[PDB]
Every structure is written in C-alpha cells, then in structure tokens.
C-alpha cells in the first residue's frame, strides 16, 4: 500500500521561565520512530521504533545536530513573529512545523509537504508543486519574500524528492516485519437501555492498524447522523488503534440498525448488528 514519513516540531516560548521548549517527533505512517525533547536529559535524537536502533553513530549525530539547529531557528523565529504581530514580551507563543513525503505502493514519490503555523493557525505553507508558498496573512507575506530570495522552495523540494523518500523507502525495508502489516479491527456491539423506551447501541473497533477507519450507522438502510456519537480514533498504546460509534434507538427497534466498518486490513467491509 501507500506510505508516509512525517516530522512534527513544536516550539513553545515561556517568558521569564527560560528558553523555549522544543519537541520533535518522527513518524512512518502511524508508527513513531524518533523523538527529541529539549527538556529531556539526553539532548539527543532518540530511537522510538526497534528498526531504527541499528542506525550507526553518524545517523544519530546528524539527526541531533538538525533538531538542535531547528530549535535555535524557532527561538529566533519566536521573537521575529512576536514583532510582526506587535505582541508583548510576556505572553507564551507557539510555532509548529510539519513536513514529510508520501510514497505509492510501487514506491514512487507521490507528494511532499511543508507547513508552518503560529499560535495554532496557518502561517506559511509549501504548495503541492513544491515550487512556491502560500502566506496566510500580511505577516506571513514578509516571510514569503525572505523565503523566495533564499530559494527555500528549491531547498524543500531537494529534501522531499531526495533524502525524504529515499530514507522512507530504507525504513520501510528495515521495519518490513512490522510496517507492512495491517491488523484488521476486532469488532463487537454493546447495548445499553437508557430508559424504558430508548437504548444506546455502540459499535466497537479494537486492535486495528493503520489508524484510518470508517464506522457508519444506518437505520432501514438510511445513513444516520441523528444521534451518531463518534469518538476520535485513539491509540491502544501497543501500536494499535481503537474507535467506537454509538446511536440512540427506540426500544424494540434495535434490529433496524447496522454499523458498517471499513478498514484496509479487512478482507471485505463488515456489517454489524444487534442480535
């Protein structure tokens, strides 16, 4: 199937309380494989998947060097952006960066991404062609002109089409035993009377991987969004994911409902019902 590699960075200023805190995490699909936290003891990029432990000292030294320089860049960017928005020196602010690449099932480069945010909102983003930027506002337009004069899009495209996809393909090979698997959901339904004339039906999906899943409720074949409570897909903590969708139904009409489960790991989509 298709795969992705992504890096997520977060810098949070803490005026008076010292230098900004910097956190970096790396993922292949839904699997975390590396982390860096500026407040942790090691001061190094650390392995978070067994298949990356084998990388030699040169790998770890360069990755540490990169996340440290990224944390220094964000530290200067926190002051720059505070100035662009004419903000006080006392408030805490956040810069978030996401980047990475996707590969198809044949291993071809599909797409690359580089998106930056300020205080939880779009700031500047690399366009799909990897040759130009989209600035969210007037402040980001200043950044865009500096990034154009610096050939920043050319830098991103060179990484995304080169090092990003080549190392993603290497990781997919090194962690093949685990990254290529799909664990189908184990499904079941629960029923809870909520009064003498109404009941909750809850459709469960557990132990699945990748995280992508669709749970849909129908009444007499018609799609339900009336009473459909749907929780966010959540990690089990062992590398699998969980989700549930619930509907409120009239007592005695439970059999007019079905929950349809779609997941990549399922030989065929499932339909669940209360028996």
């Amino acid at each position: 199937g298709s795969h992705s590699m992504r890096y997520f960075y977060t810098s949070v200023s803490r005026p008076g309380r010292g230098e900004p805190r910097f956190i970096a995490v790396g993922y292949v699909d839904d699997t975390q494989f590396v982390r860096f936290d500026s407040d942790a003891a090691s001061q190094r990029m650390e392995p978070r998947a067994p298949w990356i432990e084998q990388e030699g000292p040169e790998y770890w030294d360069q990755e540490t060097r990169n996340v440290k320089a990224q944390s220094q860049t964000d530290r200067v960017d926190l002051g720059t952006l505070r100035g662009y928005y004419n903000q006080s020196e006392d408030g805490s602010h956040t810069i978030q960066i996401m980047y990475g690449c996707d590969v198809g099932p044949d291993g071809r480069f599909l797409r690359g991404y580089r998106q930056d945010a300020y205080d939880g909102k779009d700031y500047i983003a690399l366009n799909e062609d990897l040759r130009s930027w989209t600035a969210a506002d007037m402040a980001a337009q200043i950044t865009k002109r500096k990034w154009e004069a610096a050939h920043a899009a050319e830098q991103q495209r060179a990484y995304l089409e080169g090092r990003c996809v080549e190392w993603l393909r290497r990781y997919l090979e090194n962690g093949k035993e685990t990254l290529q698997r799909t664990d189908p959901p184990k499904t079941h339904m629960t029923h809870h009377p909520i009064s003498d004339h109404e009941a909750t039906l809850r459709c469960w999906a557990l132990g699945f991987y990748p995280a992508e899943i669709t749970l849909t409720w129908q009444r007499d074949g018609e799609d339900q969004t009336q009473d459909t409570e749907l929780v966010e897909t959540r990690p089990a903590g062992d590398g699998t994911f969980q989700k549930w969708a619930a509907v409120v139904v009239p007592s005695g009409e439970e059999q007019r409902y079905t929950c349809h489960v779609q997941h990549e790991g399922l030989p065929k989509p499932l339909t669940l019902r209360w028996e």
Partner: peptide, 10 residues
C-alpha cells in the same frame, strides 16, 4: 532522516 538544509529565518 530530518531536513538539515532549510534553517532559514522567518
């Protein structure tokens, strides 16, 4: 592998 080629100030 992280990107080390674009530490360009905003």
């Amino acid at each position: 592998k992280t990107n080390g080629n674009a530490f360009i100030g905003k």
